[PDB]
Amino acid sequence: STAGKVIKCKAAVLWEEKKPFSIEEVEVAPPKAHEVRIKMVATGICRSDDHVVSGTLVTPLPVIAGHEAAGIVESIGEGVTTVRPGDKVIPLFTPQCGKCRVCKHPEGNFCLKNDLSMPRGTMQDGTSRFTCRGKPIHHFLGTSTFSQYTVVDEISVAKIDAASPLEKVCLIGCGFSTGYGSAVKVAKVTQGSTCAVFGLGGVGLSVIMGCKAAGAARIIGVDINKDKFAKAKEVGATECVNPQDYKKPIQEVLTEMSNGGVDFSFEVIGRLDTMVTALSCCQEAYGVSVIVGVPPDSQNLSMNPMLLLSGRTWKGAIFGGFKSKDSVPKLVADFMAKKFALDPLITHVLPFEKINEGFDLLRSGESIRTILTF
Amino acid sequence: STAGKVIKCKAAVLWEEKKPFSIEEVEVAPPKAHEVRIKMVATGICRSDDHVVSGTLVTPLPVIAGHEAAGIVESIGEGVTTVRPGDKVIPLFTPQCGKCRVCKHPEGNFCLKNDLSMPRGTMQDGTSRFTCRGKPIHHFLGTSTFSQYTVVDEISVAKIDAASPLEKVCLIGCGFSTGYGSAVKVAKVTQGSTCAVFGLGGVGLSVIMGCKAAGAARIIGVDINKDKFAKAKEVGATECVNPQDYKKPIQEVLTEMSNGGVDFSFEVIGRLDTMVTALSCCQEAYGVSVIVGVPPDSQNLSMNPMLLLSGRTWKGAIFGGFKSKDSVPKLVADFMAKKFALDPLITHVLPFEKINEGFDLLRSGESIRTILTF
Ligand SMILES: NC(=O)C1=CN([C@@H]2O[C@H](COP(=O)(O)OP(=O)(O)OC[C@H]3O[C@@H](n4cnc5c(N)ncnc54)[C@H](O)[C@@H]3O)[C@@H](O)[C@H]2O)C=CC1
Ligand SMILES: NC(=O)C1=CN([C@@H]2O[C@H](COP(=O)(O)OP(=O)(O)OC[C@H]3O[C@@H](n4cnc5c(N)ncnc54)[C@H](O)[C@@H]3O)[C@@H](O)[C@H]2O)C=CC1
Ligand SMILES: O=CNC1CCCCC1
Ligand SMILES: O=CNC1CCCCC1
Ligand SMILES: [Zn+2]
Ligand SMILES: [Zn+2]
């Protein structure tokens, strides 16, 4: 009864930076060739969505944000072969076109069809499927999940197990898979190693889960909010440190604690200073440091390249290095088989209409991952 | 007839920065426990020795520099078990104590006994074996090869094949092994890949040799001195580019030439800007960049961490990543088995007394690696 027709529904529109979302009616066009329209069931609030509000992460406005979500296919455009109406799906903020050099490379996952490097805020075809007050509204990362319905390109959606609990597995669309993969795929944490994790939010906790799954002997959580420490320990941290408790810079503290530097460190905050601190705290000859946090737009860090010349490895990654469409269904299958837990990350549940309260909870430091239900 | 006695011999003393070496008589004390005195046969002129003269590399002065060399053991101190008088040996500017956490790690080679991180310019016991005009003179990297005789710690010397030609294998003491290992061990260049090498001196040419040995399909040499291009092609480069010939930044040129970025890049010059350019020219999702060149003292580079967040890997290494005492004898054996060539690196051979002429050749752009013969 809606296939081929415009859907009027509620969405959370961001009209300008540093303002509350506006919950109001939008028009969602029907899918074009190779597009899929999704009825949203649940979406997480990730710090990257807040970065759009704050101007840390620049993408065109006005916009429908939201990228960590799960829903049910309402209809498919011509030529779609990988999902059908009624299927449970997770939108992919990093596409997997399967055809570019990156998709073909064994390690790479940052598909060249992504809307991160040169943001347009559109569908792959350079147009939008959203109108609000008669005005076109931008998409975000080809997902836009803060809406009762969205339209995504086929390369930006994965079909998942029909018995999946969507109010949990939405986290596989971003924060869990990013943190977990950063440890197990990008860093390749080894048995018996010492790890340091900077930032103990939903992504930082998922890095800890991955370090523990890899068999690290020590996992040192680092956060300036000591309220984050109890849950970090529950999911695997062996110790936690608050830099503001020390007279010395935390790189020196962590080097001392690890008898000369950690094996693996992770920046999971988004600050230039902690990216350099995290590099410095890994062992100078064989340490590895992974940047996960998002830096403020266009800003450069400063660092001494002798930190690398001694033998450190520095890398970053999007989405935990996972090739998104191949990996999301397998991660859902692993969750259904109890291979990792998502409940530790979910501290609050709210209806979609209370989105602004959910962002207030994140900004206050009180939540890890609020899940919004449509 | 010299064992146990002070040797008076000639050496090239650097009394202050930005002056010629002074060729004059020095006194070399006999080796103490766990020390080895070596009669020098050949030593190369590396850019790192010039960095001491120019102040790019800070180490205590006055100093006997030189670190890329080969000689014959004249005597051993009490307790030495790994070399004996008459053995051919290469001094190791990165020691291999075998007992620290780095020596025990499968990947690491920057042994914690090194004199690079916190330069003291002494023997391991904190004293010097050199006197000149009655003044104590510092050591350099535990080697000090610009002298007819030197004294090194046992952990800073390797015994090599008694039939090895020392006027060639001295390059395995630094420049060849550094560049070759930077490609084959640190970057782990893959078959069929595209590489970019910034800097076509002795070390960059050895990176090219390593990329070719690893089966790279394309090897792009980058240098502002086009006189370096002919020899770079002889040893494996498929193309060379001079940044000065282009209106656009060379990272943009290399990205276009490689249809979206190279697989592996190497900075083998020692400039902050070319370290950032080499990182940028590797493919953003799966590229790897290795810093080999030595930065000017105490200076920081500036970079945008989104270069790493997309997926790049940035690393650096000392001495090609080779564990020094284990690897140098094997590299000499490989050379004797014709597995790689050293003659392409050697453009000039001069008596030791012409050391300053050798440095003038390096600074003018005319030489790759002058070998000084004692
Ligand atoms: N690379 C990728 O693909 C992804 C990157 N992100 C980014 O990862 C980062 C973390 O995201 P979430 O876990 O959702 O954020 P979050 O805000 O819940 O967690 C960040 C933590 O960092 C702590 N923190 C803030 N400043 C600190 C400081 N100076 N020192 C030590 N701790 C400090 C906070 O107290 C907080 O607990 C964000 O920058 C996000 O945008 C998130 C998912 C995907
Ligand atoms: N990481 C390690 O263990 C080692 C580091 N080094 C360092 O590696 C570097 C290279 O050493 P060598 O090959 O002996 O030096 P070299 O001086 O013979 O070669 C450097 C090359 O860089 C070129 N060059 C200079 N400025 C340039 C620019 N803006 N753009 C492009 N090319 C430029 C020069 O024309 C020259 O051909 C030096 O910094 C040296 O100190 C050397 C050996 C060991
Ligand atoms: O949080 C989800 N996606 C992020 C990935 C890192 C760059 C900004 C967008
Ligand atoms: O060239 C030999 N050794 C170099 C190694 C890199 C730091 C400066 C000294
Ligand atoms: Zn692709
Ligand atoms: Zn050691």
UniProtKB/Swiss-Prot annotation, chains A, B:
Residues that coordinate or bind NAD(+): 48, 199-204, 223, 228, 292-294, 319, 369
Entry keyword set: Acetylation, Cytoplasm, Metal-binding, NAD, Oxidoreductase, Zinc
EC number: 1.1.1.1
Protein name: Alcohol dehydrogenase E chain
Positions bearing N-acetylserine: 1
UniProt remark on cofactor binding: Binds 2 Zn(2+) ions per subunit.
Organism: Equus caballus (Horse)
Catalyzed reactions per annotation: a primary alcohol + NAD(+) = an aldehyde + NADH + H(+); a secondary alcohol + NAD(+) = a ketone + NADH + H(+)
UniProt record, GO biological process: retinoic acid metabolic process; retinol metabolic process
Any Pfam family the entry gives: ADH_N
Binding annotation for Zn(2+) 1: 46, 48, 67, 174
Binding site residues for Zn(2+) 2: 97, 100, 103, 111
Cofactor(s) listed: Zn(2+)
Quaternary assembly: Dimer of identical or non-identical chains of two types (E and S) coded by 2 separate genes at different loci.
A Gene Ontology term for the protein's cellular component: cytosol
GO MF annotation: an example: all-trans-retinol dehydrogenase (NAD+) activity
